[PDB]
């Protein structure tokens, strides 16, 4: 779930105070709450590995469903633009 | 019988500014029309699927703007880098290549382009601003239900696409656009681009230093012209101003009464009992729907205009950057040789590198040369005379050469060509044949 | 109705300048300074550009000139004879005239009111009801203006696309020789000439 | 092994007609909606920036 | 890629060898001279 334009601290406070209008709650663990420029993303593990974009979120961040460790889960990552290619330029 | 032919040339670099994307907006229909009011929302339900339609229209626009950005900039499948030497025959690209010493790795020109354009919407986690000052008005400040979504590609990602396109163009010419990138020395890329415009490759090599110096001067001139002139980035600022004006008007419409006793929904609910409040609320709902439908209709029209601009920008990037276009004035004034993209907020700037003929001289010409009763026509170029001797020259740059059998072809008797001029056509092979034995 | 910034005389002057430039200097007109070239050599270059050896023009120069002159006479006769030849511009004029006549016609509509005339409503009714009847006429007339402006924005976008196509065709067909098939007429392209027309 | 080669040619001239501009119009909302009626104008003021 | 022998028909001559940057030394095979020396002997 993406909370658009909201700081994750405010989301955590509102959840603990039971102030949010929707009555459902997304399972919160460490590393399951990630602050993006678009908003607060809860329910996806952020990873350092960059991949091609699948489900766009915004500001470079995209989510996908991928196998981690042993166990498929939703992850979020910074988009890869493409493979690198160094051209052997010379005179 | 008079023809003018350039004896010199000028390297000209011009700029073209195109919008690529529009600010992505989102409207909370319930917050805008019936903010925190159950009775108003329940009345709003009697108008059917209003919000269900605006949400789709604005989502379609937002997706279209990200599609437009990808179509213009995501034209390359690999991220190309230049060599660490960065010597390209004397051509100085330091003003268009990324500057490693600055954050975001923008070029100096890109840095100026981003600094000149003022962005009123400033999409970010707006709660960071909090309060403690007079409200910014950035245009609902979120509170009235109007928000701005960030782009999928950040300015750094767009800069990286631009850098990849620039490195590919510089190090491989057009072979990267069509297939795998093939390294080529830059001066030979220029030689082939000279051939593209009908000018023999040797013109580049004798004048390679002059061409490199004129190119570097033109780039410096662009840097200074963009810095000096305030209203340089007119089109992009106009797009920003139109979106800001649309949001300012949409928010300001909330203060209108539309015939109601008060523009504030809470005042209507506080002062009146349900049966009268419903009438005053219906009047406000009607006005709010008219405002939102007008806003969305103009946003759809602007989105179509931006889509057309983005499609033109993508076509220009494909034909001007990934190749050498032959379309006149498509890629700047002059004979198109090449272009360089630069990122700009909500758009793209193309730097078009062309040649302008200069220092022309008018020579006497002739459709054909008559020798031993045969009409000789040029294979390439035109015949010229300086008043005493006839020469064959390439059309786009003055370079006289002796008229020979190898330079011309023969078709028909001299009597058919109206303007044929009597002159000697030299015959190679025969001359040396004599020298061999005689 | 506002006049255009460029009058018909200024548009005619631009067309004349484009014709003089193309006729005197060929494909150089739009790239840099105009360079004079004899017209038969301009055509010889254009023939070579389409893939026909330049000797064909010179050997058949009189035939080509006669076919060109005949074709131009036929064009003038074709435009004279066919009333629908210029339909696109007459349609633009008629659509704008229809939109303005529609807005004026809408002022006579009641839109649910007892009367289409504001002075009759104010004279015959008390203020309380008069404000309601006026609000109905205002709603209807405001919707009529919003519809007109929306239609004008859509038509303006269509005209913008047409104008951009016309500018591209003039820059690629008049200021040069295009290799785009069917972009500059049917057949292998040699050249083009602009002519001014009202609104196009 | 059969190819057709032209032995003659025709010079053809065709016409293409494109609109470039449309009539420029301007609307005074007060006179159009409220034909010099003060009460109408005062009611019209409640519709804001339209 | 299709290598061919560098000859006076494949190339053209313009200017001296001092102005071109990066010019290399190589043989250019003239057909006519070769035929002259086969015809003679
Ligand atoms: C490629 O072009 C760039 C500029 O477009 C060259 O960088 C420039 O190098 C000159 C070297 O003298 C710098 O001049 C310096 O200017 C400062 C101005 O305060 C002065 O105090 C210094 O004493 C010196 O005169 C110039 O500023 C600098 N410009 C930039 C933007 O960095 C670069 O060297 C060129 N590279 C090649 C290989 O030609
Ligand atoms: C290629 O086609 C052109 C026409 O497109 C041929 O030129 C035409 O040749 C005919 C003769 O067969 C000319 O007709 C004659 O016209 C004169 C006019 O005074 C008339 O007195 C004669 O009795 C006869 O009707 C026709 O005018 C001429 N067209 C033009 C524009 O000059 C050309 O001969 C063809 N060439 C080949 C090799 O097929
Ligand atoms: C036209 O060009 C020819 C070729 O350069 C000129 O004749 C040569 O002039 C140079 C001096 O500039 C002499 O060294 C050559 O020996 C001349 N060659 C011949 C064959 O005359 C000629 O003078 C030029 N004429 C004009 C009017 O510019
Ligand atoms: C080009 O040269 C030819 C042959 O040298 C000239 O042909 C002569 O033209 C004159 C008329 O000017 C005739 O009286 C002769 O009988 C022609 N002789 C031949 C052998 O054809 C031709 O006139 C010359 N053209 C120019 C422009 O000098
Ligand atoms: C390419 O060949 C030319 C001619 O053989 C070389 O020029 C000669 O260079 C030597 C020294 O290297 C001088 O002593 C001669 O006087 C030069 N002769 C001429 C006519 O220039 C040239 O140096 C060679 N270049 C390379 C890179 O090998
Ligand atoms: C990415 O690597 C850095 C290395 O310092 C580490 O600090 C950071 O926590 C890593 N992020 C994730 C999501 O693993
Ligand atoms: C290309 O030539 C320049 C000449 O200054 C030289 O500095 C550079 O190292 C050369 N490049 C390579 C790859 O040798
Ligand atoms: C061409 O013009 C440049 C200046 O733009 C000048 O330096 C150069 O010498 C000129 N060349 C000739 C052949 O006149
Ligand atoms: C969220 O709030 C905390 C409060 O301490 C602040 O430090 C952080 O920078 C805020 N982040 C955003 C994205 O607003
Ligand atoms: C060259 O052009 C100039 C332009 O004024 C003209 O005066 C001059 O006579 C022309 N010379 C030739 C030989 O055409």
From TrEMBL, chain A:
Q: How is it modified after translation?
A: The cytoplasmic Cys-rich domain is palmitoylated. Spike glycoprotein is digested within host endosomes. Specific enzymatic cleavages in vivo yield mature proteins. The precursor is processed into S1 and S2 by host cell furin or another cellular protease to yield the mature S1 and S2 proteins. Additionally, a second cleavage leads to the release of a fusion peptide after viral attachment to host cell receptor.
The highest taxon in the source lineage is Viruses
The subunit structure is: Homotrimer; each monomer consists of a S1 and a S2 subunit. The resulting peplomers protrude from the virus surface as spikes.
- What does this chain do? Spike protein S1: attaches the virion to the cell membrane by interacting with host receptor, initiating the infection. Spike protein S2': Acts as a viral fusion peptide which is unmasked following S2 cleavage occurring upon virus endocytosis.
Return the domain comment text from this UniProt entry: Fusion peptide 1 (FP1) and fusion peptide 2 (FP2) function cooperatively and have a membrane-ordering effect on lipid headgroups and shallow hydrophobic regions of target bilayers. They are considered as two domains of an extended, bipartite FP. The membrane-ordering activity is calcium-dependent and also dependent on correct folding, which is maintained by an internal disulfide bond in FP2.
The entry assigns this protein to a family as follows:
Belongs to the betacoronaviruses spike protein family.
- Would you tell me the protein name for this molecule? Spike glycoprotein
**Organism per entry:** Severe acute respiratory syndrome coronavirus 2 (2019-nCoV)
UniProtKB/TrEMBL annotation, chain B:
Query: What is the species of this protein?
Result: Severe acute respiratory syndrome coronavirus 2 (2019-nCoV)
Tell me the protein's name. Answer: Spike protein S2
Top-level taxon of the source organism = Viruses
Residues the record annotates as the site (Cleavage) are 106-107
Q: List the disulfide bonds.
A: 131-139
**Residues annotated as region Fusion peptide 2?**
126-143
Domain Coronavirus spike (S) glycoprotein S2 subunit heptad repeat 1 (HR1) region profile stretches: 184-289
- Gene designation per UniProt: S
Q: Region Heptad repeat 1: start and end of each range?
A: 208-258
Q: Where are the stretches annotated Fusion peptide 1? A: 107-128
Residue stretches in coiled coil: 237-281
């Amino acid at each position: 779930v993406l909370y658009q334009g909201v700081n994750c601290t405010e989301v955590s406070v509102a959840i603990h105070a039971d102030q949010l209008t929707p009555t459902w709650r997304v399972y919160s663990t460490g590393s399951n709450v990630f602050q993006t420029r678009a908003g607060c993303l809860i329910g996806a593990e952020y990873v350092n590995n960059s991949y091609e974009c699948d489900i766009p979120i915004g500001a470079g961040i995209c989510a996908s469903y991928q196998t981690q460790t042993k166990s498929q889960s939703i992850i979020a990552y910074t988009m890869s633009l493409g493979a690198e290619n160094s051209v052997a330029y010379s005179n | 019988n008079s023809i003018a032919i350039p004896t010199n040339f000028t390297i000209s670099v011009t700029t073209e500014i195109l919008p690529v994307s529009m600010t992505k907006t989102s409207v909370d229909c319930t917050m805008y029309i019936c903010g925190d009011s159950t009775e108003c929302s329940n009345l709003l339900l009697q108008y059917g699927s209003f919000c269900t339609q605006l949400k789709r229209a604005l989502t379609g626009i937002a997706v279209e703007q990200d599609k437009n950005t990808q179509e213009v900039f995501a034209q390359v499948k690999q991220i190309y880098k230049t060599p660490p030497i960065k010597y390209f025959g004397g051509f100085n690209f330091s003003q268009i290549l990324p500057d490693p010493s600055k954050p975001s790795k923008r070029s100096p020109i890109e840095d100026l382009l981003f600094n000149k354009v003022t962005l009123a919407d400033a999409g970010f986690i707006k709660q960071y601003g909090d309060c403690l000052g007079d409200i910014a008005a950035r245009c609902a400040q979120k509170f009235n239900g109007l928000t701005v979504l960030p782009p999928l590609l950040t300015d750094e990602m767009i800069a990286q696409y631009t850098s990849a396109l620039l490195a590919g163009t510089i190090t491989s010419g057009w072979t990267f656009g069509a297939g795998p990138a093939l390294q080529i020395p830059f001066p030979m890329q220029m030689a082939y681009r000279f051939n593209g415009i009908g000018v023999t490759q040797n013109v580049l090599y004798e004048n390679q230093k002059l061409i490199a110096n004129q190119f570097n001067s033109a780039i410096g001139k662009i840097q200074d012209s963009l810095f000096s002139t305030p209203s340089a980035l007119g089109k992009l600022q106009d797009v920003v101003n139109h979106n800001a004006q649309a949001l300012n008007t949409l928010v300001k419409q909330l203060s209108s009464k539309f015939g109601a006793i008060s523009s504030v929904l809470n005042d209507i609910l506080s002062r009146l009992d349900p049966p009268e409040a419903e009438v005053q609320i219906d009047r406000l709902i009607t006005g709010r729907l008219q405002s939102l439908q007008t806003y969305v209709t103009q946003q759809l029209i602007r989105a179509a205009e931006i889509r057309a601009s983005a499609n033109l920008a993508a076509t220009k990037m494909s034909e001007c950057v990934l190749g050498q276009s032959k379309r006149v004035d498509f890629c700047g004034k002059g004979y198109h040789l090449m272009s360089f993209p630069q990122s700009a907020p909500h758009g793209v700037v193309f730097l078009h590198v062309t040649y302008v003929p200069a220092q022309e001289k008018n020579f006497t010409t002739a459709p054909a040369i008559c020798h031993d009763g045969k009409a000789h026509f040029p294979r390439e170029g035109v015949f010229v005379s300086n008043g005493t001797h006839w020469f064959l020259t390439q059309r786009n740059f003055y370079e006289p050469q002796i008229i020979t059998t190898d330079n011309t072809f023969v078709s028909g008797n001299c009597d058919v060509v109206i303007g044929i001029v009597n002159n000697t056509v030299y015959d190679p092979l025969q001359l040396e044949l004599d020298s061999f034995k005689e």
